[PDB]
Amino acid sequence: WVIP
Amino acid sequence: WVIP
Amino acid sequence: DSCIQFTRHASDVLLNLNRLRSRDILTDVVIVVSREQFRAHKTVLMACSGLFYSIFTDQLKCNLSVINLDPEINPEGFCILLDFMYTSRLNLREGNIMAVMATAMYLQMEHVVDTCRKFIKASE
Amino acid sequence: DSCIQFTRHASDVLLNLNRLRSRDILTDVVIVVSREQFRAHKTVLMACSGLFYSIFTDQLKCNLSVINLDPEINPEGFCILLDFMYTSRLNLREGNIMAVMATAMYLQMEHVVDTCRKFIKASE
Ligand SMILES: O=C1Cc2cc(Nc3nc(Cl)ncc3F)ccc2N1
Numbered sequence: 001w002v003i004p
Numbered sequence: 005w006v007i008p
Numbered sequence: 009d010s011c012i013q014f015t016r017h018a019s020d021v022l023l024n025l026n027r028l029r030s031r032d033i034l035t036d037v038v039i040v041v042s043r044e045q046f047r048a049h050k051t052v053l054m055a056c057s058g059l060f061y062s063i064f065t066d067q068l069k070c071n072l073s074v075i076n077l078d079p080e081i082n083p084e085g086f087c088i089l090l091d092f093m094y095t096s097r098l099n100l101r102e103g104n105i106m107a108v109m110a111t112a113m114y115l116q117m118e119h120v121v122d123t124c125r126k127f128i129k130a131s132e
Numbered sequence: 133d134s135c136i137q138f139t140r141h142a143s144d145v146l147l148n149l150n151r152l153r154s155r156d157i158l159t160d161v162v163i164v165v166s167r168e169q170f171r172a173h174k175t176v177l178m179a180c181s182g183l184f185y186s187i188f189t190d191q192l193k194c195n196l197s198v199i200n201l202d203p204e205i206n207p208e209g210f211c212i213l214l215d216f217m218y219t220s221r222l223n224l225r226e227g228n229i230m231a232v233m234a235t236a237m238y239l240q241m242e243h244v245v246d247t248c249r250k251f252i253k254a255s256e
């Protein structure tokens with residue numbers, strides 16, 4: 001999961 | 005396009 | 009093999025599937041979550057959820073155009089997860105995390121259940 | 133928004149859509165390319181091809197379960213492009229590049245047409  |  | 013691969017292809021396919029959903033093109037099922045209705049593509053739901061995979065591989069249920077979810081399921085939680093299926097983006101907030109995690113457990117979306125557990129653990 | 137994003141989601145969705153295709157699950161169209169038949173999902177074809185997008189958004193054609201392509205289309209070229217749609221990988225070879233490029237122009241798959249043009253230019 002990432003900060004888009 | 006890339007070499008997978 | 010000796011194939012070449014287009015890096016952005018899968019993301020571009022998903023973006024187009026979400027554009028078809030927006031425009032109600034070739035949607036073939038309505039998911040009912042109490043008083044709310046959500047239109048979607050059975051194939052996208054099966055590709056994202058172990059529960060929908062089991063439903064639409066069943067010889068009788070594969071033919072239904074309406075699926076009613078358990079009344080304990082929160083429509084907002086379902087809406088957030090449906091948007092995730094079609095976009096890869098999860099709108100996880102302090103005010104919705106418990107409903108999202110409970111809905112992802114029911115729908116059998118293991119990666120979502122995993123990030124919810126981690127965010128809850130961080131708050132404790 | 134304040135969303136989080138699962139990097140591998142789109143690739144995982146496409147992998148599952150290809151597994152449904154393999155297992156002939158919820159395929160809803162047969163594409164006929166002379167003597168050959170290919171089963172697929174209309175939504176995946178529309179998401180990848182400008183030609184299929186135009187076909188399945190047409191009020192009469194959206195309801196057909198069989199689509200016959202132009203007899204000049206090579207079945208091997210179509211097969212390579214259908215595999216690309218479902219996997220992001222293109223099996224481009226000296227012996228098939230002309231048929232693949234001609235099929236991608238017909239199907240309106242601009243990124244494929246672009247890589248074929250570049251590989252042809254490199255050989256000249
Ligand atoms: O957490 C999850 C997400 C998820 C999706 C699927 N989907 C499919 N699985 C297979 Cl093997 N082939 C085709 C499919 F559409 C099954 C189980 C699970 N569990």
Ligand SMILES: O=C1Cc2cc(Nc3nc(Cl)ncc3F)ccc2N1
Binds near residue numbers: 024179180240243
């Ligand atoms: O080279 C290409 C690939 C391609 C795909 C599509 N697909 C869709 N386009 C839109 Cl805007 N919404 C939903 C779709 F399924 C249209 C044109 C083109 N041309």
Ligand SMILES: [Cl-]
Binds near residue numbers: 056118119120121
């Ligand atoms: Cl997931």
Ligand SMILES: [Cl-]
Binds near residue numbers: 180241242243244245
């Ligand atoms: Cl393309």
